[PDB]
Design an enzyme around this catalytic site. Sequence first.
Site, PDB file in Angstrom:
ATOM      1  N   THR B 278       2.591   7.911  -1.551  1.00  0.00           N
ATOM      2  CA  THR B 278       2.100   6.959  -2.825  1.00  0.00           C
ATOM      3  C   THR B 278       3.209   6.190  -3.380  1.00  0.00           C
ATOM      4  O   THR B 278       4.504   6.729  -3.435  1.00  0.00           O
ATOM      5  CB  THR B 278       1.434   7.822  -3.956  1.00  0.00           C
ATOM      6  N   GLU B 531      -4.755  13.675  -2.432  1.00  0.00           N
ATOM      7  CA  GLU B 531      -5.367  13.937  -0.964  1.00  0.00           C
ATOM      8  C   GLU B 531      -6.546  12.956  -0.732  1.00  0.00           C
ATOM      9  O   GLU B 531      -7.407  13.156   0.078  1.00  0.00           O
ATOM     10  CB  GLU B 531      -5.741  15.435  -0.848  1.00  0.00           C
TER      11      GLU B 531
HETATM   12  C1  LIG Z   1       0.195  15.663  -0.545  1.00  0.00           C
HETATM   13  C2  LIG Z   1      -0.853  15.309  -1.135  1.00  0.00           C
HETATM   14  C3  LIG Z   1      -0.664  15.867  -2.584  1.00  0.00           C
HETATM   15  C4  LIG Z   1      -0.523  17.549  -2.593  1.00  0.00           C
HETATM   16  O1  LIG Z   1      -1.271  18.115  -2.270  1.00  0.00           O
HETATM   17  O2  LIG Z   1       0.249  17.916  -3.278  1.00  0.00           O
HETATM   18  C5  LIG Z   1      -1.249  13.966  -1.224  1.00  0.00           C
HETATM   19  O3  LIG Z   1      -2.122  13.367  -2.199  1.00  0.00           O
HETATM   20  S1  LIG Z   1      -0.616  12.711  -0.014  1.00  0.00           S
HETATM   21  C6  LIG Z   1      -1.229  11.093  -0.723  1.00  0.00           C
HETATM   22  C7  LIG Z   1      -2.584  11.107  -0.380  1.00  0.00           C
HETATM   23  N1  LIG Z   1      -2.876   9.517   0.319  1.00  0.00           N
HETATM   24  C8  LIG Z   1      -4.261   9.291   0.726  1.00  0.00           C
HETATM   25  O4  LIG Z   1      -5.022  10.246   0.975  1.00  0.00           O
HETATM   26  C9  LIG Z   1      -4.541   7.973   1.061  1.00  0.00           C
HETATM   27  C10 LIG Z   1      -6.252   7.605   0.862  1.00  0.00           C
HETATM   28  N2  LIG Z   1      -6.259   6.326   1.457  1.00  0.00           N
HETATM   29  C11 LIG Z   1      -6.614   6.469   2.837  1.00  0.00           C
HETATM   30  O5  LIG Z   1      -6.455   7.266   3.650  1.00  0.00           O
HETATM   31  C12 LIG Z   1      -6.436   4.878   3.733  1.00  0.00           C
HETATM   32  O6  LIG Z   1      -5.749   4.148   3.101  1.00  0.00           O
HETATM   33  C13 LIG Z   1      -8.137   4.493   3.462  1.00  0.00           C
HETATM   34  C14 LIG Z   1      -9.152   5.586   3.580  1.00  0.00           C
HETATM   35  C15 LIG Z   1      -8.340   3.686   2.394  1.00  0.00           C
HETATM   36  C16 LIG Z   1      -8.365   3.550   4.575  1.00  0.00           C
HETATM   37  O7  LIG Z   1      -7.521   2.614   4.735  1.00  0.00           O
HETATM   38  P1  LIG Z   1      -7.755   1.228   5.491  1.00  0.00           P
HETATM   39  O8  LIG Z   1      -9.263   0.633   5.200  1.00  0.00           O
HETATM   40  O9  LIG Z   1      -7.021  -0.063   4.755  1.00  0.00           O
HETATM   41  O10 LIG Z   1      -7.521   1.253   6.991  1.00  0.00           O
HETATM   42  P2  LIG Z   1      -9.094   1.469   8.128  1.00  0.00           P
HETATM   43  O11 LIG Z   1      -9.779   2.543   7.915  1.00  0.00           O
HETATM   44  O12 LIG Z   1      -9.553   0.221   8.236  1.00  0.00           O
HETATM   45  O13 LIG Z   1      -8.114   1.333   9.553  1.00  0.00           O
HETATM   46  C17 LIG Z   1      -6.890   0.991   9.679  1.00  0.00           C
HETATM   47  C18 LIG Z   1      -6.519   1.292  11.107  1.00  0.00           C
HETATM   48  O14 LIG Z   1      -6.043   2.764  11.135  1.00  0.00           O
HETATM   49  C19 LIG Z   1      -7.002   3.520  11.886  1.00  0.00           C
HETATM   50  N3  LIG Z   1      -7.478   4.905  11.459  1.00  0.00           N
HETATM   51  C20 LIG Z   1      -7.862   5.037  10.472  1.00  0.00           C
HETATM   52  N4  LIG Z   1      -8.131   6.222  10.118  1.00  0.00           N
HETATM   53  C21 LIG Z   1      -7.370   7.040  11.331  1.00  0.00           C
HETATM   54  C22 LIG Z   1      -7.288   8.220  11.704  1.00  0.00           C
HETATM   55  N5  LIG Z   1      -7.886   9.437  10.839  1.00  0.00           N
HETATM   56  N6  LIG Z   1      -6.529   8.439  12.681  1.00  0.00           N
HETATM   57  C23 LIG Z   1      -5.908   7.447  13.497  1.00  0.00           C
HETATM   58  N7  LIG Z   1      -5.976   6.178  13.250  1.00  0.00           N
HETATM   59  C24 LIG Z   1      -6.988   5.934  12.315  1.00  0.00           C
HETATM   60  C25 LIG Z   1      -8.059   2.801  12.274  1.00  0.00           C
HETATM   61  O15 LIG Z   1      -8.609   2.848  13.286  1.00  0.00           O
HETATM   62  C26 LIG Z   1      -7.446   1.337  12.207  1.00  0.00           C
HETATM   63  O16 LIG Z   1      -6.822   1.108  13.546  1.00  0.00           O
HETATM   64  P3  LIG Z   1      -6.722  -0.377  14.189  1.00  0.00           P
HETATM   65  O17 LIG Z   1      -8.029  -0.951  14.075  1.00  0.00           O
HETATM   66  O18 LIG Z   1      -5.648  -1.320  13.807  1.00  0.00           O
HETATM   67  O19 LIG Z   1      -6.326  -0.261  15.519  1.00  0.00           O
HETATM   68  C1  LIG Z   2      -0.462  16.055  -9.134  1.00  0.00           C
HETATM   69  C2  LIG Z   2      -0.585  15.001  -8.361  1.00  0.00           C
HETATM   70  C3  LIG Z   2       0.228  15.219  -7.062  1.00  0.00           C
HETATM   71  C4  LIG Z   2       0.252  14.284  -6.102  1.00  0.00           C
HETATM   72  N1  LIG Z   2       0.915  14.773  -4.831  1.00  0.00           N
HETATM   73  C5  LIG Z   2       1.524  13.462  -3.853  1.00  0.00           C
HETATM   74  C6  LIG Z   2       2.455  13.897  -2.805  1.00  0.00           C
HETATM   75  O1  LIG Z   2       2.730  14.853  -2.601  1.00  0.00           O
HETATM   76  N2  LIG Z   2       2.659  12.558  -1.865  1.00  0.00           N
HETATM   77  C7  LIG Z   2       1.929  11.218  -1.988  1.00  0.00           C
HETATM   78  O2  LIG Z   2       2.348  10.540  -1.347  1.00  0.00           O
HETATM   79  N3  LIG Z   2       0.942  11.249  -3.157  1.00  0.00           N
HETATM   80  C8  LIG Z   2       0.609  12.306  -4.095  1.00  0.00           C
HETATM   81  N4  LIG Z   2      -0.443  11.991  -5.110  1.00  0.00           N
HETATM   82  C9  LIG Z   2      -1.046  10.741  -4.969  1.00  0.00           C
HETATM   83  C10 LIG Z   2      -2.546  11.075  -5.073  1.00  0.00           C
HETATM   84  O3  LIG Z   2      -2.865  10.968  -3.468  1.00  0.00           O
HETATM   85  C11 LIG Z   2      -2.961   9.599  -5.434  1.00  0.00           C
HETATM   86  O4  LIG Z   2      -3.113   9.641  -6.869  1.00  0.00           O
HETATM   87  C12 LIG Z   2      -4.460   9.212  -4.867  1.00  0.00           C
HETATM   88  O5  LIG Z   2      -4.316   8.705  -3.570  1.00  0.00           O
HETATM   89  C13 LIG Z   2      -5.023   8.026  -5.750  1.00  0.00           C
HETATM   90  O6  LIG Z   2      -4.277   7.044  -5.913  1.00  0.00           O
HETATM   91  P1  LIG Z   2      -3.747   6.165  -7.275  1.00  0.00           P
HETATM   92  O7  LIG Z   2      -3.210   7.292  -8.282  1.00  0.00           O
HETATM   93  O8  LIG Z   2      -2.716   5.267  -7.089  1.00  0.00           O
HETATM   94  O9  LIG Z   2      -5.228   5.710  -7.870  1.00  0.00           O
HETATM   95  P2  LIG Z   2      -5.808   4.283  -7.739  1.00  0.00           P
HETATM   96  O10 LIG Z   2      -5.704   3.800  -6.075  1.00  0.00           O
HETATM   97  O11 LIG Z   2      -4.946   3.206  -8.248  1.00  0.00           O
HETATM   98  O12 LIG Z   2      -7.265   4.327  -7.928  1.00  0.00           O
HETATM   99  C14 LIG Z   2      -7.612   4.314  -9.381  1.00  0.00           C
HETATM  100  C15 LIG Z   2      -9.158   4.708  -9.179  1.00  0.00           C
HETATM  101  O13 LIG Z   2      -9.979   3.810  -8.900  1.00  0.00           O
HETATM  102  C16 LIG Z   2     -10.607   4.219  -7.443  1.00  0.00           C
HETATM  103  N5  LIG Z   2     -10.360   3.224  -6.648  1.00  0.00           N
HETATM  104  C17 LIG Z   2      -9.535   3.087  -5.783  1.00  0.00           C
HETATM  105  N6  LIG Z   2      -9.937   1.787  -4.836  1.00  0.00           N
HETATM  106  C18 LIG Z   2     -11.170   1.511  -5.263  1.00  0.00           C
HETATM  107  C19 LIG Z   2     -11.962   0.583  -4.825  1.00  0.00           C
HETATM  108  N7  LIG Z   2     -11.628  -0.319  -3.765  1.00  0.00           N
HETATM  109  N8  LIG Z   2     -13.061   0.436  -5.325  1.00  0.00           N
HETATM  110  C20 LIG Z   2     -13.625   1.341  -6.170  1.00  0.00           C
HETATM  111  N9  LIG Z   2     -12.740   2.239  -6.608  1.00  0.00           N
HETATM  112  C21 LIG Z   2     -11.623   2.491  -6.053  1.00  0.00           C
HETATM  113  C22 LIG Z   2      -9.895   5.491  -7.012  1.00  0.00           C
HETATM  114  O14 LIG Z   2     -10.953   6.474  -6.274  1.00  0.00           O
HETATM  115  C23 LIG Z   2      -9.539   6.067  -8.522  1.00  0.00           C
HETATM  116  O15 LIG Z   2     -10.678   6.658  -9.263  1.00  0.00           O
HETATM  117  C24 LIG Z   2      -0.381  13.096  -6.033  1.00  0.00           C
HETATM  118  C25 LIG Z   2      -1.074  13.048  -7.546  1.00  0.00           C
HETATM  119  C26 LIG Z   2      -1.037  13.669  -8.311  1.00  0.00           C
HETATM  120  C27 LIG Z   2      -1.776  13.688  -9.545  1.00  0.00           C
END
Ligand SMILES: C[C@@H](CC(=O)O)C(=O)SCCNC(=O)CCNC(=O)[C@H](O)C(C)(C)COP(=O)(O)OP(=O)(O)OC[C@H]1O[C@@H](n2cnc3c(N)ncnc32)[C@H](O)[C@@H]1OP(=O)(O)O
Ligand SMILES: Cc1cc2nc3c(=O)[nH]c(=O)nc-3n(C[C@H](O)[C@H](O)[C@H](O)COP(=O)(O)OP(=O)(O)OC[C@H]3O[C@@H](n4cnc5c(N)ncnc54)[C@H](O)[C@@H]3O)c2cc1C
Lengths: 555, 555
Positions: B278, B531
Site C-alpha cells: 500500500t 487484506e
Molecule cells: C498485510 C495485510 C495487513 C495485515 O494483515 O497486517 C495487508 O493488508 S497487505 C495489502 C493488501 N492489499 C490488497 O489486498 C490489494 C487489493 N487489490 C487487489 O488485490 C487487486 O488490485 C484487485 C483485486 C483490485 C485486482 O486488480 P486488477 O483488476 O487491476 O487486476 P486484474 O484482476 O484484472 O488482473 C491483472 C493480472 O493479474 C492476474 N491475476 C489476477 N489475480 C491473480 C492471481 N490470484 N494469481 C495470479 N495472477 C493473477 C490476472 O490474470 C491478470 O493477468 P494478465 O492478464 O495480465 O496476464
Molecule cells: C491497521 C491497518 C493495517 C494494514 N497493514 C498493511 C500491511 O502490512 N502492508 C500493506 O501493504 N497494506 C496494509 N494495509 C492497507 C490495507 O490493505 C488497505 O487499507 C486496503 O487495501 C484498502 O485500501 P485503501 O485504504 O487505500 O482504501 P481505498 O483504496 O482508497 O478505497 C476506499 C474505499 O472505497 C472502496 N473502493 C475502492 N475502489 C472502489 C471502486 N473502484 N468502486 C467502489 N468502491 C471502491 C474501498 O473498498 C474502500 O471502502 C493496512 C491497513 C490498515 C488500516
Amino acid sequence: MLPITAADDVQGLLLQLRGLLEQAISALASRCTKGRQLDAELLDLMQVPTFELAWASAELLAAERSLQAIDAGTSSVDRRLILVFAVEAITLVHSRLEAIYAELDLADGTLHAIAADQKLRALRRSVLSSTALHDSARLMVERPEQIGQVAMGDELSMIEDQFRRFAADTVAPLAEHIHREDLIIPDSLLAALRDMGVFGLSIPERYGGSAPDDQEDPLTMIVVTEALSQASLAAAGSLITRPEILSRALLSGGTESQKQHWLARLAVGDPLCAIAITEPDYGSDVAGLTLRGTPCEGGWRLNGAKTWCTFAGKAGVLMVVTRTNPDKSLGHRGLSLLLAEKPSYDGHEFDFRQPGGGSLTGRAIPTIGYRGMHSFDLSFEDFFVPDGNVIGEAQGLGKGFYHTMAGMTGGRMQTAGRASGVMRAALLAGLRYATERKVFGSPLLDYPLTGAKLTKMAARYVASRYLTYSVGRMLAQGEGRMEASLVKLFACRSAELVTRESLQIHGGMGYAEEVAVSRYFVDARVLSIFEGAEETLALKVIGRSLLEAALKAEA
Amino acid sequence: MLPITAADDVQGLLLQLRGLLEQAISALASRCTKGRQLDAELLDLMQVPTFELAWASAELLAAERSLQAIDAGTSSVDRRLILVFAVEAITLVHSRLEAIYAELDLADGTLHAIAADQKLRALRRSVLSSTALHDSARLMVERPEQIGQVAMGDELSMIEDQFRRFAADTVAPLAEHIHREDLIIPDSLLAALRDMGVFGLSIPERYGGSAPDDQEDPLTMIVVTEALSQASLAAAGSLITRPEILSRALLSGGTESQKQHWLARLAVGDPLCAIAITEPDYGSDVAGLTLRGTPCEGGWRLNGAKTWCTFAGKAGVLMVVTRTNPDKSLGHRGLSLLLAEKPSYDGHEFDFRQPGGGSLTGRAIPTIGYRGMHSFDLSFEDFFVPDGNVIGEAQGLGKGFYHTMAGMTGGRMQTAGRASGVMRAALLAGLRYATERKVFGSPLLDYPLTGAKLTKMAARYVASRYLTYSVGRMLAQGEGRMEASLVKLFACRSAELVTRESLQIHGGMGYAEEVAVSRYFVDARVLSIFEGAEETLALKVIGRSLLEAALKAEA
Ligand SMILES: C[C@@H](CC(=O)O)C(=O)SCCNC(=O)CCNC(=O)[C@H](O)C(C)(C)COP(=O)(O)OP(=O)(O)OC[C@H]1O[C@@H](n2cnc3c(N)ncnc32)[C@H](O)[C@@H]1OP(=O)(O)O
Ligand SMILES: Cc1cc2nc3c(=O)[nH]c(=O)nc-3n(C[C@H](O)[C@H](O)[C@H](O)COP(=O)(O)OP(=O)(O)OC[C@H]3O[C@@H](n4cnc5c(N)ncnc54)[C@H](O)[C@@H]3O)c2cc1C
Ligand SMILES: C[C@@H](CC(=O)O)C(=O)SCCNC(=O)CCNC(=O)[C@H](O)C(C)(C)COP(=O)(O)OP(=O)(O)OC[C@H]1O[C@@H](n2cnc3c(N)ncnc32)[C@H](O)[C@@H]1OP(=O)(O)O
Ligand SMILES: Cc1cc2nc3c(=O)[nH]c(=O)nc-3n(C[C@H](O)[C@H](O)[C@H](O)COP(=O)(O)OP(=O)(O)OC[C@H]3O[C@@H](n4cnc5c(N)ncnc54)[C@H](O)[C@@H]3O)c2cc1C
C-alpha cells in the site's frame, strides 16, 4: 427526477404496514395478559416478538414523521432522502413483520400481497435505483447545507448558526487531543460553554436559566446539543446531559427552596453536576439499586458503591439514587434522590474525606471512546447527606424512582440530539472524502456503489433528525413520553450504522486516530448502551407501553 | 429437538435460491458484455447489483457448505446451529435477490413463490422459534467445546489443543496491556512463538519449514491462526500473516537459490518480514502503485512512499512492490517484488541510513485497534536493493503483480482464520457473561432475547468456520482462488457483527478497556478494510470471477 406519484405510493404502503403492525401488537398484548392485566412472567416469555415489534415501530414512525414533513420549504435534497428512507423502511418493517407473524402464528397472506405489490417494485426501481441514489449523492455534494434542514423558526436557526460557528472555531480544534490523551475538559472550554448558556437551557428563567417559564419546548436544547456534539460528543455535546437530568428531577420533586437554591447554581455551572444512578450490580434495573442510606441525626449516612458516574471528579454535586428504606420488599418504593456535595477534582482519581469521618473515593474507568469527563467507580463510606439535600425533603423519601424516571425522559431526548450531531459529523466527513479520494482513475464519489452508501447514510441521518424534532414537539405539548425512548433507540443505533459506513468509505484512513471518523465510530458505540440500553428500552419502555395501550383500547 | 424433515426442506429452498442467483449472474454478465468480453465501463456502471450478488453468493455458499458437512460425527450443538444459519440465509439471500431482480428488471414471480412457501414458514416456527433458539443457547453453555467442531483429524485436533493451551497461558495475559499502551510485541513472546514453529507453517520441509513438500495444505496454518487470534488478533494471530504472504510469493516467483536462502531464515524469524504494498495514493488499486525503482550498478535505487506497512519497524526484510519500469501505462506489468533489508527497530519511528547513503525512515500510524506490530508511513530515498533481492532475479522484473496476487490468496485465507478466532473469543465471552450477570432477578442467559442473540451469533461463527475449512480443503487441491476472497469477505464482516453483539450483551462493561470484548470490537473493525477491502473484493475479485465464469459457460 423521481416519479410524481412516489410520495403517495409510499404513504399508502406505510399505512398498510401500520395496520399489520397494530394487529400484531394486539395479538401480542393478548398473549401477555392474565386476568385483564399484563403479566410479568408472560412478558419475559415473549421478549423476542416484543423486541422486534419495538424496532418495527421505530422504523415505521421514522418513515411516517419524515414523510409528513415534506412541505413547500423542504430542500430538494431532503425530499429525495426522505423518500429513500421511506422505501427502505417499507422493506425493513415488512421483513420484521414476517418474522413477528411467524412467531405469533398469525396469518401472513396480506404480507405476501404487500411484497408482491407492483407499486413497491416500481419504487425500488425508481427511488432506490442506482442512478437515483447516485444523483442524490451528487446533489448532497453540491448543497450539503440542505441535508437535514428541518423546519425551525429564524430564532432557532440563528441559535444553530452561532453554536455551529463556536463548535467549529473552539471545540473542534480540541476534540482529537482530548480523546487521544484522555484529558479532562479544559477549564477554558467549560468557562466558554458556561457563558454561551450551555448549562441553563433546561432550567426556567425564574430559576436563573434560559427556558421560558410557562412552557417546556426542548427544541432549543436539542439544536445546541446537535451543533456541539458534531464537534465533540463527550467534551461539548454531553455537558448538557447532566443538568437536563437533574433539573428535571428537581422540577419533578424538589421543594421551592431546593429549586431556588440549586437550579440557579446549576445554570451557571457552580456547581457542575453528575448523575449517580448505576451500581456495579444494577444498571438497567434501577428499581433494584442497593446503595444504603441510614438515618442519623440531621441527615443520612451512605454506604456502598456507584459506578460509571460520568464527570464525578469535577462535579460539585452528585444526584445519588439511595435506598433509604431497609425493607427490600418495597422495590423502587424504597428509593430516594440525595444530593451529595463534594469538592471539585481535575484528575482520574480522588479521595474526599468528610468532617464527621465519612469518605467518598473515586477512580476513573478507561473507555474506548466518549472521553473527556471520565466515568468513575465510587465508594461511599459513612458519607453524610443532610435532610435538606433529599430532593423533596421528607415527602421525597421513597419517591426517588419517579423523579429519576422524569429525568430520564429528558436525557433520552437529549441523547437523540447527541446521536444526530455525531451522525452529521460522520456523514459530512464521508461526503468530503469521497469527493477528494481517487480510485481506479476517478473520484470515489463517481462510483455507483459509493453513491448508494452515501445516500443511504444520509437518508437514515435525515429520517432520524425529522423524527427527533417531531418527538421534541410532542414533548412541548405534554406528550411523547414513550416516543423519547423510541427516537433515542432509533437515533443511537443509526449513529452506529452511519459511523461504521463512513469509516468504510475512508478505507484504511478511517481506522487512524488522526482521522476524525475513527473517533466518531468508537464514540457512537456507547449511545445504544447508556441512557437506557437498546434492549431495556425496547422491552420495558417501548414494548410495554405499546402493549398497555392495546389492552386499554380493547377493554 | 428440531424436526427431522428440516434438512431436506432447507436444502430444497437453498437450491431454488441458487437457481435464481445464477440466472441473475447471467443477466448481469450480459449487461456488462461488449463484444464477447466484460467491459470495464459497464462493470463500473453496474457496481450495485454486482456488490449485492457477491454478498448473496457468500451467504448462500456458507449455508450450503455447512449443511453439506453434517455427518455422524457432527456435534449436537452444530447440527442445531447449522440449521439456524441456513434458515436465516434463505431469508437473507431471498431479500438480496429481490433488490437485485428489481434493479436488473427481472421477473420476480418465483421469488414470491419462495417467500410464500409453507415449508419456509414452518422452518421459521420450528428452527427460528424463541424456544428453539433459547434451547440452543443453554446447550452451548453445557457443551462449549461442541460449538463449531469441524471435522479436523487427530493430528490437527492435537495441534489445536496445544496452541489453545499456549494462547490461554502465555498470550491472553499480555493482550490487554499491549493494546492499552500500544506496545511493540514483546521479544519474550516472539521467541516463544518462534520455537512453537509459528513462522514456518506454510514453508515446505525441504526449505526449512514444517509444511509438506508435495502438498499445500492450509488447514494447519488456519487452525493455529484461529487459536492464537482468540487470545490476541494483532500480537499473536497476525504473526502468521506476513510469512504466509511472502513465502507464497517466493514459492511462486523466486529462484531455487532464493527459496533456499530466504525461506529457511524466515521460518525461524531471522529476519521477521513485513509486507509493503500500500501507498498513500493507492491501496485497492495495486496495479497503479508508483514507488519508483531506478536501475543502478548492481541493483536498484528506490524513491517514494509506502504506508500502512505493518511490523515494518521490527522486520529485517520488507516485501516491496516496486514500479521498476518507467512506462506507467503498463499498469501491473511494470511492477516487481524487491526484498528491502534493514536493521530491526522496536519503536514507533525509525531512521535507517545505508553505508552508501540511501535512506529509509518510518513513523507509526496510531490506530483504534489491531495494536502490537505498528503500521508505518515509510519514506525511501535512493534506497539500494541489490539485483539478487528482486524475487525471480532478472526474470522477476515486471512479474511482481502476479506473485503479489498469489500471496494475497494465502493472506486472505489466513485472514478468514483470524476473523474466526476473534469471533470465537467474542462468542465465548458473551456466553460466559450471560451466565454470570443477573438482571431483574435471573441470569441474563435465562431471557429469551439473550438466547436468540447468543444462538444467532454462534450460528454465524459456525457457518463461517465450516465455510473457512471447506475453502481450505479447496486450496489444498489447487482450487478455491476466488473462494479465498469470498470466505474472507464473509468471515471478516461476520466478526464485526459478532463482536458488536457480544459487547451489547455486556452492557456498559463492554465499553471498558479493562474488559476484553471492547478490544475484540475495535480489532474486528479492521478486518473488512485490510487484506482487500470488502468493496474491492466483492467487485473486482468475487463479482468479476462470477461474471467471467458466466460468460465462458455461455460461449
Ligand atoms: C498485510 C495485510 C495487513 C495485515 O494483515 O497486517 C495487508 O493488508 S497487505 C495489502 C493488501 N492489499 C490488497 O489486498 C490489494 C487489493 N487489490 C487487489 O488485490 C487487486 O488490485 C484487485 C483485486 C483490485 C485486482 O486488480 P486488477 O483488476 O487491476 O487486476 P486484474 O484482476 O484484472 O488482473 C491483472 C493480472 O493479474 C492476474 N491475476 C489476477 N489475480 C491473480 C492471481 N490470484 N494469481 C495470479 N495472477 C493473477 C490476472 O490474470 C491478470 O493477468 P494478465 O492478464 O495480465 O496476464
Ligand atoms: C491497521 C491497518 C493495517 C494494514 N497493514 C498493511 C500491511 O502490512 N502492508 C500493506 O501493504 N497494506 C496494509 N494495509 C492497507 C490495507 O490493505 C488497505 O487499507 C486496503 O487495501 C484498502 O485500501 P485503501 O485504504 O487505500 O482504501 P481505498 O483504496 O482508497 O478505497 C476506499 C474505499 O472505497 C472502496 N473502493 C475502492 N475502489 C472502489 C471502486 N473502484 N468502486 C467502489 N468502491 C471502491 C474501498 O473498498 C474502500 O471502502 C493496512 C491497513 C490498515 C488500516
Ligand atoms: C447520564 C447518562 C450517561 C451519560 O450521558 O453520560 C446515563 O446513562 S444515567 C443512567 C441511565 N439509567 C437508565 O436509563 C435506567 C434504565 N432503566 C429504567 O429506566 C427503568 O428501570 C426501566 C425502564 C427498566 C423500568 O423499570 P421498572 O419496570 O422496574 O418500573 P415500572 O416501569 O414498571 O414502573 C415503576 C413505577 O414508576 C412509574 N414510572 C414509570 N415510568 C415513569 C416516568 N417516566 N415518570 C414517572 N413515573 C414513572 C411507574 O408508573 C410505576 O409507578 P407505580 O406503579 O409504583 O405507582
Ligand atoms: C461511558 C459510560 C458512561 C456512563 N455514564 C453514566 C452516568 O453518568 N450515571 C449513571 O448512573 N450511569 C452511567 N452509565 C451506565 C449506563 O446507564 C448503563 O450502562 C446502562 O443503563 C446499562 O446498564 P448495565 O451496564 O448495568 O447493563 P445490564 O443492566 O447489566 O444489561 C446487560 C445487557 O442485557 C440487556 N438486558 C437488561 N435487562 C434485560 C432483560 N430483562 N432481558 C433481556 N435483556 C436485558 C441490556 O439491554 C444489555 O444489553 C454509563 C455507562 C457507560 C459505558
